[PDB]
Structure 1
Amino acid sequence: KEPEQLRKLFIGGLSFETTDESLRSHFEQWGTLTDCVVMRDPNTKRSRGFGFVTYATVEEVDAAMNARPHKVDGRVVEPKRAVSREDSQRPGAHLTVKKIFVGGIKEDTEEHHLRDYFEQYGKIEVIEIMTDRGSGKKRGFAFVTFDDHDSVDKIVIQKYHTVNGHNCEVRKALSKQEMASAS
């Protein structure tokens, strides 16, 4: 069976009145939920405004994401691929981004190589193989922009990505200032 982590969705912006039962009731429309819960304050037992839903298969997860926008208990919520506790440590880990940093690509890497691997994740809007200003030399990394944040999330939650025959590190793109803040 597929890994729990890839079968789980983080549901953000939950209404103050959303409960395990009401959440389950809504998301159950796209599959069998093996787990459904609203995080609450360990003390006040008040809802922290977010929860998690886990389907029996990632296919069902995809159905749910393809069903956006979602409105639960009269409120628009934000469903996202669950970022593991380990990766949640990374700066910007939970931000909604459409651009990815692709690091460690060969010198002879060309745009078709990137498309042949990334198009299966979603509509690609921009592709940029970075070069040195003035030297024209390839820097060994590229940026790819999609039209849906879920395309990016489906990517970054995986460990390996093969472009132009070899593995590369793919992470959410961080702005110039976001970089220096986490530097």
Structure 2
Amino acid sequence: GSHMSDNNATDILFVGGIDETIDEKSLYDIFSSFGDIRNIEVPLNMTTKKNRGFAFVEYVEVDDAKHALYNMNNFELNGKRIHVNYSKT
């Protein structure tokens, strides 16, 4: 156990705190294995590829949303730990 995720997240998924060799297209295909994707907002800088603690991710279907974020607390991305929670739209 690391961090318990209990929220009402329908169609809205926050992933912030990702490692500095991923880009836009890579966060599409690693989550598309259960769920294909609507729209992606991930700012990235051309000197270090820093994301500054924050990125937004919208899914296609509303059941699949819930089963992915509850599995995503204990999952590490390229040896870095991602904080995963519900957002505003």
Same fold (TM over 0.5): yes
Per the alignment, do residues 87 and 108 of structure 1 end up closer, same or farther by CA in structure 2, a change over 3 Å counting?
closer
SS where residue 33 of structure 2 aligns? helix
Instruction: Give 1 or 2 for the bigger CA radius of gyration.
Output: 1
Checking the alignment, whether the CA contact within 8 Å between 2:24 and 2:40 is kept in structure 1 is yes
Greater helix content = 1
Which of 14, 23, 40 is residue 127 of structure 1 equivalent to? 40
**1:128-167 CA deviation, whole Å, 9 max, x = no partner?**
11469xxxx632331111111222211121232343x133
Q: Which structure ranks higher in relative contact order (CA pairs < 8 Å, sequence separation ≥ 6)?
A: 2
- 2:54 equivalent in structure 1: 141
Checking the alignment, whether the CA contact within 8 Å between 2:14 and 2:56 is kept in structure 1 is yes
**Counterpart amino acid of residue 124 in structure 1:** I
Alpha-carbon distance in 2 for matches of 1:170, 1:139:
15
- 1:114 equivalent in structure 2: 27
Q: Percent identity?
A: 29
Alpha-carbon distance in 1 for matches of 2:23, 2:13:
17
Alpha-carbon distance in 2 for matches of 1:125, 1:157:
20
Q: CA RMSD in A?
A: 2.6
**Counterpart amino acid of residue 85 in structure 2:** R
Greater strand content = 1
State whether structure 2 residue 82 is matched by structure 1 residue 168.
yes
Normalised to the residue count of structure 1, the TM-score between the two structures is: 0.37
Alpha-carbon distance in 1 for matches of 2:83, 2:74:
7
SS where residue 141 of structure 1 aligns? coil
Structure 2 gaps of 5+ residues are: none
How many residues get paired?
80
SS where residue 98 of structure 1 aligns? coil
Alpha-carbon distance in 1 for matches of 2:5, 2:20:
29
Per the alignment, do residues 162 and 128 of structure 1 end up closer, same or farther by CA in structure 2, a change over 3 Å counting?
farther
Per the alignment, do residues 116 and 150 of structure 1 end up closer, same or farther by CA in structure 2, a change over 3 Å counting?
same
Structure 1 gaps of 5+ residues are: 1-85, 177-183
Checking the alignment, whether the CA contact within 8 Å between 1:152 and 1:172 is kept in structure 2 is no
Per the alignment, do residues 139 and 152 of structure 1 end up closer, same or farther by CA in structure 2, a change over 3 Å counting?
same
Checking the alignment, whether the CA contact within 8 Å between 2:12 and 2:59 is kept in structure 1 is yes
